[PDB]
């Protein structure tokens, strides 16, 4: 059965703060400092701010303070060394609540009655114990479920620039993320109160607030607990999905703001910087965040991770989107140009990719023609973009018959297939039928990427 | 009291300072220069000084004040200009008898000598009074009358003695709260830490538009009362003029103009122009300057004081929101705040982020722009104020790829991107309609349905016309206008007319200084109707080449509709626009007959 | 909308009625196990352990 | 269409108020557990306050609480802050406490133990000591109140498994 | 009466430090200093006898980082005596400067006596109280039409001249300097040559004598061969002399700061020596404030009849506006007179390109009695038609003259007779603002009244 320990461990209070700068507090003469320990800085005003030991020396401990170092006095701040890494108290009753960045509740509810104290950093899942997820989720979005299909257990972000409706797309996916009963955990990371209220309103309207736990860290919230928010949200997701055999859909919005928090912390440590000033280990940090998805051999549960991401200047080469593409399994690319043209969702399926569509596509899973239809659509859309560039450069008359057909397909594809209203939930079969109605523009001879056994059966 | 140990520009590492807190305020130097602590290393606490550090000597005493950078709030805020730190420029000038800002002037933040007509609120003796409750209103001026005196947000307890109605100076006690046996005396003014946002009961969705009065702005990229706004653009694009034409004629009740790193003559222009303009609100022709306060930290004034000016401006705006006023804080040259942060970080030696800026610039800007937003005030009675932030990000070299511009676009809900190319041609306000956007268009449907029902339809229609003609002109510039159809030629001509007679708004002109919402809607209807009827006429078989000569009169009447002075009244200008629409319809009917 | 607004009070009363059983169950569980939990907590708080740091 | 849209908006309003009616009631259940749990800690605090009254039974606990915090400090000299009602006890227990620290830590005995005159607040602290370093810069809040606070923070899952059966959902 | 001078009628001893604890680049690091004062001018005495000035930049306890203006070449640890003057750099100003020629540091080089100081003023200056500022509404009849009618110059205007390497910025800036005069009633002039070659130095020093200005112009000539860091204090010296003159003797000063790009390069070459934050294009991050400290020392102040106009000549590298020097100068200043390489190649003088040119004090000082009522509308209409002509010229170069519409052909004609008969002007030909507006109206009369979409109907009726 369950095992637990009624144990009391007295905690050392250190008034020996050496210096404080940025988010870091340096202590002076800690006794046996413990790495990645959690400390409680008692300010002279009496307020208590949690911390986290980032680096230790013979007697020093460079504590990062989650709630900011404003007001910390080198002569009256007392640091209390708890004796263990940051552990969130989880429970099955945590569903349906709202928590701040540091895991404390926001709603008028009480402190979460603990069911287990899980370390937020988690533990590495044995790759031999991971099940390859081959059960597609029908997100309802045509440009996702038809060309960049998501499998239940896949960590696929939403690469969207600043000011694009990535919040609307993610809310839509959360609303209609059934299979071809998802519990949701949300980690707001410096999103403005408008975006957080929109997400909360959508989750309440769609009935999801009964089975979702939000970890709201607004832009007004301190900028260092953005490093605890993804870990808290993901250890809650791991708890629910694995140790309650539940299905979890984690939404880690503003991973760009998470990486900005890492940059702020790293730059105050004077560490050797990577590209754009981000820490060298930011690949490993983003990996520790993202890689907590996927199903497991024993426990019937899945964390379908959808970390919304704000690529600055709408660039993939930027370190945050680049490393997120390296770690995660494909990405959903939201295009500023398409949004300006007025399409919703403004998903550009050319940079978009889903690494598990190759397995969850079809041939008995969803439909026989799914994979070939998706490949044909992607190829003809690339041809359409090339034809549009050629027409813009050297005139539309010079375009060939194939190029003109590609332009017509591009127009009828952006304006009728990608374009779908919010709260529209076309099934994958309806999406494939619309795709075919697009592909019937071409003659059967110019559909080369379609396998003939499916072309002759669906054309 | 510590001692200076090292000075390098606007950083003063002061030794023998065990006990100073982060962001505490210190009085660095003999002249008592105002400084804030930003880094602590044992005894030595690195201080940034909001005053010219030249002349400082090692060993100059630095006094720890014991309180973070605090702005004094209360009556007398309105109709005054302030430095970065909360210092009145008028009082500084009259105290120094000179035209220079002396180093270390400590004039009181609010004029103590002036006596205000305090009239007590609903609160009586013995009633429990929580933070932010209103216990009296002072008559500030004819426009900001009933400057309702809030209780400090952190203060609570029961009233023991409330002052009767009369005249009181700020130093005079007005109310004494007993809380757990410790009586605290409250006056007309209360200090507040600028870094800490003022608490509110609950923020609200901003559903009412900040009518800038400029056609392009409030007809294509609306800003709501309580929405963050950004105006990127190179020098001469018109960010300052848009900010001034917003603070001159918006529907905001009170305005906190912040010249963070602006030009001195710009603030002088505001000081001489606002008293000469009158706001039709409050039922009288009261001057604008009675509702605007200014935080002038010009470009050459101390680098560190730019951050103080921004935070002081936003704190004043937050206070006037807690009072229940639709404030609209305007942070002129918000990129100068980013440059001040970069300079201070360079002095500190901190590792840079992208393009020299510190790693926390995005976080600071986000926490600053999150102060905006309509919100119910903290205490009884129920009050619904709003702070709208319209900050002019100034890109380095004119490219929007600046880190400050990106970190501002990531947080602001509106983006009034200016175009240098349109600015050069005097096409003003030079709003780049291609890249500019407003995320409040969906929110404003609930207001455009109540008033001007066809406004959103016209807005999307004109955006469609402008986008189509922009693409068509891009094609024509390389492929010639030979292949254009008659409908495409009409789109080109109509969008050229829109750009040259509707989107362009010649400020500093009698007619088009303030094109209000009703005149903007009528002009918008006239332009859209002209386009639609021209396209219908060409579809009926009439050639566009002949129709242009036939309807040049209608086209010039439409283009001259912007000359209808809004001062003639809503009924008069609406009647003139109805007559113009009738004349337009008759002219097209006669031409197509 | 008026019809939906009128049912809010009835819905609130119905929700309150269903919860009242859970509150009774919580009170009963607390009253039953209060002595045991209090004894365990007191016995843990008193009678301390005394061990130097494992690395010392 | 506007009438249909308004009806859709009203319908979603019904779902919004239906959830928040159920959520508020659901958080009423959760607040009931914490309130009753607070009663467990409220009852526990009073019982521990009675331990100090029984000076015979509380006598060796205090010697343990001082030693249990002395071994964590490992400083050669320490300052022991205690209540006004325990200074007399510590003045006699110090000789044995020195030897006990010398034996358990397997090091040289304590150089000097000093009962600071800064007595603890009798209203907030029922027993125990706050042992500090020689310079009073490093200390251990080893009082009974702080000890019970730490136990409350770090034992909640055990109290849950005691008061209630393990949750039926939690498997593996 | 003037009791302030008597308070400084005292003697204060100075400490001579032979304690140079190192030197690296242009930075001399002292030691054992007795209470160092940040930003205190210091007179070094080299072993060879040469005396090099320098100002303290960082005063880490009992240590001073002294940067020397003339360079550290020849500074020895065991021989140099470093003497602390105990006060920031001050120029001895008086009304007798007007008519004298000074070096980069203010030491006269006209074989004349030292300045019989009326007072000593810190060269850094102080930020003028923005409440004490007065918005300059007195427009200057500059004489060049391209400036008088478009991008107008007010009195306290600080309007730089942007020009490429070889463009005649000096000739234009001399024409503005010699013809400037209030439109509806002379300018004392203060000059600061920073890094100009001897040809430009002699051209200015001779044009002033030719026009008779030299009787009221004080020149601060810091040529190319002068020390690179002295160019940092040359514009501060010039503006402190100008501030004295204007705001204390109540004169109207027309400050000219030639080759401001050389000053910016001096800032970069000093910042790169201190390893400061590299801003953009290598210029220091604080260069906005460094240039603002210079430019903002202009404009009229309340209660004083004086006024400082600024015309800081700027040499844009590679003729790029986006470069940090012209970009930050545009942000700080209140206008710009963009001298165009394309126009100069076309042969137009003055080669002023009005499209990038700007003047933020032209919304004032226009209309009513300040100038004719048609000025404000006519300038905007000229800008609009010039831009239309430029766009139509590009379209013509692309597709051919056959596709240009009637409006495009009118724009081409207007652009031709505008560049070749309105921007163009004799070097010594001054045009009154009224005559310039009449020529502008003559150009505008190419279009019918209907096509003039910017002129108000009242102005069209009264003047067209
Ligand atoms: N809406 C407008 N109407 C008339 N003039 C304008 C307008 N916007 C800008 N200007 C012109 O631009 C100049 C000021 O531009 P400004 O806003 O200061 O740009 P920046 O802030 O980049 O310096 C003024 O000379 C003014 O004539």
Q: Which of B264, B303, B500 sits opposite E133 (nearest CB)?
A: B264
Q: Is A193 at the interface with chain B, CB within 8 A?
A: yes
Nearest-angstrom CA–CA distance, B307 and B10: 13
Method: cryo-EM
- Give the strands of the sheet with A136-138, arranged side by side: A150-151, A136-138, A178-179
- Count of domains forming chain B: 4
Contacts 24+ apart (CB under 8 A), E203-210: E203/E170, E203/E174, E204/E170, E204/E174, E204/E258, E205/E101, E207/E174, E207/E177, E207/E178, E208/E177
Strand pairing partners for B259?
B296
Protein residue with least CA distance to atom 8, ligand 1: B238
What is the resolution in angstroms?
A: 3.5
Longest CA–CA separation in chain C, Å:
73
User: Quick one: which H or E segment has residue A302?
Assistant: strand A302-305
Hey, what CATH class is D45-160 in? alpha beta
Q: Which residues contact E148 (CB under 8 A, 6 or more apart)?
A: E141, E142, E431, E432, E433, E436
Q: Does one domain contain both B170 and B214?
A: no
Other C-beta atoms closer than 10 Å to the C-beta of B424 total 23
Q: Among residues B10, B42, B69, which one ends one of the domains?
A: B69
Place of tokens 């928040």: D20
Whether residue B429 is preceded by a cis peptide bond, meaning omega within 30 degrees of 0, is yes
Nearest-angstrom CA–CA distance, A157 and E340: 50
Q: Does one domain contain both B257 and B182?
A: no
Nearest CA in chain B to E277: B346
Contact D33 A113 (CB under 8 A): yes
Min CA distance, C14 vs chain A (Å)?
18
Ligand 1 geometric centre to CA of B391 (Å): 15
Q: Does one domain contain both B136 and B33?
A: no
- Chain A CB contacts of B204 under 8 Å are none
Nearest-angstrom CA–CA distance, D144 and D135: 23
- Is E3 exposed, middle or buried (CB count within 10 Å of its CB: 0-12, 13-18, 19+)? exposed
- Is A282 exposed, middle or buried (CB count within 10 Å of its CB: 0-12, 13-18, 19+)? buried
Chain C interface test: which of D27, D46, D71, D161 (most C C-beta within 10 Å): D71
Interchain touch A–C (≥3 Cβ pairs closer than 8 Å): yes
Is the sign of the CA dihedral A250, A256, A257, A263 positive or negative?
positive
Ligand 1 geometric centre to CA of B507 (Å): 9
- Chain D CB contacts of C33 under 8 Å are 162-163
- CB environment A21-58: b (16+ within 10 A), e (fewer): bbbbbbbbbbbebbeebbbebbbeeeeebbbbbbbbee
Q: Does one domain contain both B55 and B105?
A: no
Domain that holds residue B370: 70-113+187-438
Q: Which of E301, E364, E453 sits opposite B501 (nearest CB)?
A: E453
Place of tokens 């113009």: B580
Residue E39 backbone phi and psi in degrees, to 5:
60, 60
Nearest-angstrom CA–CA distance, A48 and A45: 9
Is the sign of the CA dihedral B89, B92, B97, B101 positive or negative?
negative
- Chain C CB contacts of A7 under 8 Å are 44
Ligand 1 geometric centre to CA of A92 (Å): 60
Q: Which residues contact D50 (CB under 8 A, 6 or more apart)?
A: none
Nearest CA in chain B to A74: B19
Residues 367-396 of A with CB under 8 A from B: 392, 395
Ligand 1 geometric centre to CA of E358 (Å): 9
Q: Among residues B124, B157, B186, which one ends one of the domains?
A: B186
Interchain touch C–D (≥3 Cβ pairs closer than 8 Å): yes
Collapse the DSSP code of E129 into the 3-class scheme (helix H, G, I; strand E, B; otherwise coil) and give the result.
coil
Nearest-angstrom CA–CA distance, B112 and C4: 56
* Structural contact between residues E207 and E168, judged by C-beta atoms closer than 8 angstroms: no
What angle is formed at CA B202 by the lines to CA B201 and CA B206, rounded to 5 degrees?
135
Nearest-angstrom CA–CA distance, E86 and E35: 10
In this structure, the dihedral spanned by the alpha carbons of residues B163, B376, B317 and A164, taken in order and rounded to 10 degrees, is 170
Q: Which of B7, B236, B355 sits opposite E358 (nearest CB)?
A: B236
Protein residue with least CA distance to atom 13, ligand 1: E360
Min CA distance, D117 vs chain C (Å)?
25
Question: Distance of CA E219 to CAs C48, D136, E241, Å?
Answer: 87, 68, 10
Give the strand pairing for B292-298 and B81-82: parallel
Q: Does one domain contain both B426 and B309?
A: yes
Min CA distance, A69 vs chain B (Å)?
7
Pick the closest to residue A137 from A85, A101, A172, A185 (CA basis): A172
Nearest-angstrom CA–CA distance, A301 and A360: 17
CA E456 to chain centre: 36
Nearest-angstrom CA–CA distance, A319 and B427: 39
Number of helical H runs and strand E runs in chain B: 16, 28
Q: Which of B56, B90, B99 sits opposite E38 (nearest CB)?
A: B56
Other C-beta atoms closer than 10 Å to the C-beta of E280 total 18
- Is B457 exposed, middle or buried (CB count within 10 Å of its CB: 0-12, 13-18, 19+)? exposed
Q: Does one domain contain both B401 and B486?
A: no
Protein residue with least CA distance to atom 10, ligand 1: B238
Ligand 1 geometric centre to CA of E137 (Å): 16
After which residues does a break in chain E occur, C–N more than 2.5 Å?
185
Nearest-angstrom CA–CA distance, E13 and D97: 67
Mutate to test the pocket of ligand 1, among B217, B232, B237, B238 (most ligand atoms within 8 A of CB): B238
Ligand 1 geometric centre to CA of B248 (Å): 14
Contact E285 B563 (CB under 8 A): no
* Structural contact between residues E42 and E72, judged by C-beta atoms closer than 8 angstroms: no
Q: Among residues B397, B413, B438, which one ends one of the domains?
A: B438
Mutate to test the pocket of ligand 1, among B216, B230, B231, B236 (most ligand atoms within 8 A of CB): B236
Protein residue with least CA distance to atom 22, ligand 1: B235
Nearest-angstrom CA–CA distance, A25 and A61: 8
Number of helical H runs and strand E runs in chain C: 1, 0
Q: Does one domain contain both B462 and B580?
A: yes
- Is B548 exposed, middle or buried (CB count within 10 Å of its CB: 0-12, 13-18, 19+)? middle
Contact C46 D48 (CB under 8 A): yes
Question: What single DSSP character describes residue A299?
Answer: S
Ligand 1 geometric centre to CA of E294 (Å): 23
Give the strand pairing for E101-102 and E217-223: parallel
Min CA distance, B474 vs chain A (Å)?
9
Nearest-angstrom CA–CA distance, E302 and B9: 30
**Ligand 1 pocket at CB < 6 A:** B 235-241, 428-429, 505-508; E 360, 362-363
Q: Does one domain contain both B291 and B336?
A: yes
Nearest-angstrom CA–CA distance, B502 and A36: 61
Nearest-angstrom CA–CA distance, A104 and A215: 9
Interchain touch A–B (≥3 Cβ pairs closer than 8 Å): yes
Collapse the DSSP code of E308 into the 3-class scheme (helix H, G, I; strand E, B; otherwise coil) and give the result.
strand
Contact C37 D105 (CB under 8 A): no
Contact C19 D25 (CB under 8 A): yes
Contacting C with CB below 8 Å, chain D residues are: 10, 13-14, 17-18, 21-22, 24-25, 28-29, 32-33, 36-37, 39-41, 43-44, 47-48, 51, 61, 64-65, 67-68, 71-72, 74, 100, 104-106, 144, 147-148, 151, 155, 159, 162-164
Contact C53 D72 (CB under 8 A): yes
Contacting D with CB below 8 Å, chain C residues are: 1, 4, 8, 11-12, 15-16, 18-19, 22-23, 26-27, 29-30, 33-34, 36-38, 40-42, 44-53, 56
| Chain C neighbours, 3+ Cβ pairs < 8 A | A, D
Contacting C with CB below 8 Å, chain A residues are: 6-8, 31-32
- Chain A CB contacts of D155 under 8 Å are 4-7
Instruction: Tell me the three-class secondary structure of B36-79, residue by residue.
Output: EEEEEECCEEEEEECCCCCCCECCCEEEEEEEECEEEECCCCCC
- Cβ pairs bridging A and D (under 8 Å): 125
Structure tokens at B217: 């702005």
Question: Distance of CA A228 to CAs A87, A190, A260, B336, C14, Å?
Answer: 11, 12, 13, 32, 40
What angle is formed at CA E163 by the lines to CA E157 and CA E167, rounded to 5 degrees?
130
């Amino acid at each position: 059965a369950v095992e637990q320990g009624f144990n009391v461990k007295p905690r050392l209070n250190y008034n020996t703060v050496s210096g404080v700068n940025g988010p870091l507090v340096i202590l002076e003469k800690v006794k046996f400092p413990r790495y990645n320990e959690i400390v409680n800085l008692t300010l002279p005003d009496g307020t208590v701010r949690q911390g986290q030991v980032l680096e230790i020396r013979g007697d020093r401990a460079i504590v990062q303070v989650f709630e900011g170092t404003s007001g910390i006095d080198v002569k009256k701040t007392t640091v209390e060394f708890t004796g263990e890494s940051l552990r969130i108290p989880v429970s099955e009753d945590m569903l349906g609540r709202i928590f701040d960045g540091s895991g404390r509740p926001i709603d008028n509810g009480p402190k979460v009655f603990a069911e287990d104290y899980l370390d937020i950093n988690g533990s590495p899942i044995n790759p031999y114990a991971r099940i390859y997820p081959e059960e597609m989720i029908s997100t309802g979005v045509s440009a996702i479920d038809t060309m960049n299909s998501i499998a239940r257990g896949q960590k696929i972000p939403i690469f969207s620039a600043s000011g694009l409706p990535h919040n609307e797309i993610a809310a839509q996916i959360c609303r209609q993320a059934g299979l071809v009963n998802f519990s949701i955990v949300f980690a707001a990371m410096g999103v403005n109160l408008e975006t957080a209220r929109f997400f909360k309103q959508d989750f309440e309207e769609n009935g999801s607030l009964e089975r979702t736990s939000l970890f709201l860290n607004l832009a007004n919230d301190p900028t260092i607990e953005r490093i605890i928010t993804p870990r808290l949200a993901l250890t809650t997701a791991e708890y629910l999905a694995y140790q309650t055999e539940r299905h979890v859909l984690t939404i880690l919005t503003d991973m760009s703001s998470y990486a900005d928090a890492l940059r702020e912390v790293s730059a105050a440590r004077e560490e050797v910087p990577g590209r754009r000033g981000y820490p060298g280990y930011m690949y490993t940090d983003l990996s520790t965040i993202y890689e907590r998805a996927g199903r497991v051999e024993g426990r019937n549960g899945s964390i379908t991770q959808i970390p919304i991401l704000t690529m600055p200047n709408d660039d993939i080469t930027h370190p945050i989107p680049d490393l997120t593409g390296y770690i995660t399994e494909g990405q959903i690319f939201v295009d500023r140009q398409l949004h300006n043209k007025g399409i919703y969702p403004p998903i550009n399926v050319l940079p978009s990719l889903s690494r598990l569509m190759k397995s969850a596509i079809g041939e008995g899973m969803t439909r026989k023609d799914h994979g070939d239809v998706s490949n044909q659509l992607y190829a003809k859309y690339a041809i359409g973009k090339d034809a549009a560039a050629m027409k813009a450069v050297v005139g539309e008359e010079a375009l060939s018959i194939e190029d003109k057909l590609s332009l017509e397909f591009l127009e009828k594809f952006e304006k009728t297939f990608i374009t779908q209203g919010a709260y529209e939930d076309r099934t994958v079969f309806e999406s494939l039928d619309q795709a075919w109605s697009l592909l019937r523009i071409y003659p059967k001879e110019m559909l080369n990427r379609i396998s003939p056994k499916i072309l002759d059966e669906f054309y | 009291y510590g001692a200076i140990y090292s000075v390098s520009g606007p950083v003063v590492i002061a030794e023998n300072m065990i006990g100073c807190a982060m962001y505490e305020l210190v009085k660095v130097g003999h002249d008592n220069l105002v400084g804030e602590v930003i880094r602590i290393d044992g005894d030595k606490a690195t201080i940034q000084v909001y005053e010219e550090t030249a002349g400082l000597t090692v060993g100059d005493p630095v006094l720890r004040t014991g309180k973070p950078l605090s702005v004094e709030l209360g009556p007398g805020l309105m109709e005054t200009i302030y430095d970065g730190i909360q210092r009145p420029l008028k009082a500084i000038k009259e105290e120094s008898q000179s035209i220079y800002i002396p180093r270390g002037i400590d004039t009181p933040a609010l004029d103590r000598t002036i006596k205000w007509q305090f009239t007590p609120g609903k609160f009586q003796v013995g009633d429990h009074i929580s933070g932010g409750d209103i216990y009296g209103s002072v008559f500030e001026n004819s426009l900001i009358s009933s400057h309702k005196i809030l209780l400090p947000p952190r203060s609570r307890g029961t009233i023991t003695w409330i002052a009767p109605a009369g005249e009181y100076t700020l130093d005079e006690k007005i109310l004494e709260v007993e809380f757990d046996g410790k009586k605290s005396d409250f006056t007309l003014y209360h200090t507040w830490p600028v870094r800490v946002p003022r608490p509110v009961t609950e923020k609200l969705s901003a559903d009412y538009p900040l009518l800038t009065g400029q056609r392009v702005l409030d007809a294509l990229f609306p800003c709501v009362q309580g929405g963050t706004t950004c105006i990127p653009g190179a020098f001469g694009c018109g960010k300052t003029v848009i900010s001034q034409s917003l603070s001159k004629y918006s529907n905001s009740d009170a305005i906190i103009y912040v010249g963070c790193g602006e030009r001195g003559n710009e603030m002088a222009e505001v000081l001489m122009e606002f008293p000469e303009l009158y706001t039709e609100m409050s039922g009288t022709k009261e001057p604008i300057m009675k509702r605007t306060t200014l935080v002038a930290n010009t470009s050459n004034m101390p680098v560190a004081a730019r951050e103080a000016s921004i935070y002081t401006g936003i704190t004043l705006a937050e206070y006037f929101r807690d009072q229940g006023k639709n404030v609209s804080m305007i942070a002129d040259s918000s990129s100068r705040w980013a440059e001040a942060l970069r300079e201070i970080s360079g002095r500190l030696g901190e590792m840079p982020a992208d393009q020299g800026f510190p790693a926390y610039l995005g976080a600071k800007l986000a926490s600053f722009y999150e102060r905006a937003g309509k919100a119910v005030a903290l205490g009884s009675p129920d009050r619904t104020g709003s702070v709208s932030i319209v900050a002019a990000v100034s890109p380095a070299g004119g490219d929007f790829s600046d880190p400050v511009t990106t970190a501002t676009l990531g947080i602001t809900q509106v983006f009034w991107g200016l175009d240098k190319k349109l600015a050069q041609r005097k096409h003003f306000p030079s709003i780049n309609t291609s890249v500019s956007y407003s995320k409040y268009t969906n929110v404003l449907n609930k207001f455009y349905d109540s008033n001007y029902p066809e406004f959103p339809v016209l807005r999307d229609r004109m955006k469609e016309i402008l986008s189509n003609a922009e693409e068509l002109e891009q094609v024509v510039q390389l492929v010639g206008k030979s292949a254009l159809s008659d409908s495409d030629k009409i789109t080109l001509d109509v969008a050229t007319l829109i750009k040259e007679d509707f989107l362009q708004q010649n400020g500093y002109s009698t007619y088009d200084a303030f094109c209000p919402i009703w005149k903007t809607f009528d002009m918008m209807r006239a332009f859209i109707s002209y386009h639609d009827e021209a396209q219908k006429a060409v579809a009926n078989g009439a050639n566009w080449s002949k129709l242009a000569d036939s309807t040049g009169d209608v086209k010039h009447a439409v283009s001259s509709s912007k000359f209808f002075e809004p001062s003639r009244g809503e009924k008069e200008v609406h009647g003139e626009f109805e007559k113009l629409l009738s004349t337009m319809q008759e002219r097209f009917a006669e031409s197509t007959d | 909308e008026q019809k939906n607004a009128g049912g809010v009070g009835e819905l609130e009363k119905k929700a309150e009625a269903g919860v009242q059983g859970e509150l009774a169950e919580i009170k009963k569980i607390a009253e039953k196990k209060k002595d045991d939990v209090v004894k365990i907590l007191i016995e843990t708080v008193i009678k301390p352990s005394a061990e130097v740091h494992i690395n010392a | 269409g506007n009438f249909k849209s308004k009806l859709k908006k009203a319908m979603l309003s019904q779902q919004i108020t239906k959830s928040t009616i159920a959520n508020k009631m659901r958080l009423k259940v959760l607040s009931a557990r914490e309130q009753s749990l607070d009663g467990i800690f409220e009852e526990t605090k009073e019982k521990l306050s009675g331990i100090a009254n029984n000076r015979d039974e509380y006598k060796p606990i205090l010697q343990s609480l001082i030693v249990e915090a002395l071994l964590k400090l490992l400083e050669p000299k320490a300052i022991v802050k205690a209540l006004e009602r325990d200074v007399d006890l510590i003045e006699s227990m110090k000789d044995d406490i020195m030897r006990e620290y010398g034996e358990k830590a397997q090091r040289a005995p304590l150089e000097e133990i000093v009962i600071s005159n800064d007595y603890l607040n009798k209203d907030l602290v029922s027993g125990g000591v706050v042992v500090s370093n020689a310079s009073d810069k490093i200390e251990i809040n080893n009082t009974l109140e702080e000890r019970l606070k730490l136990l409350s923070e770090e034992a909640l899952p055990a109290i849950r498994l005691e008061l209630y059966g393990p949750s039926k959902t939690r498997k593996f």
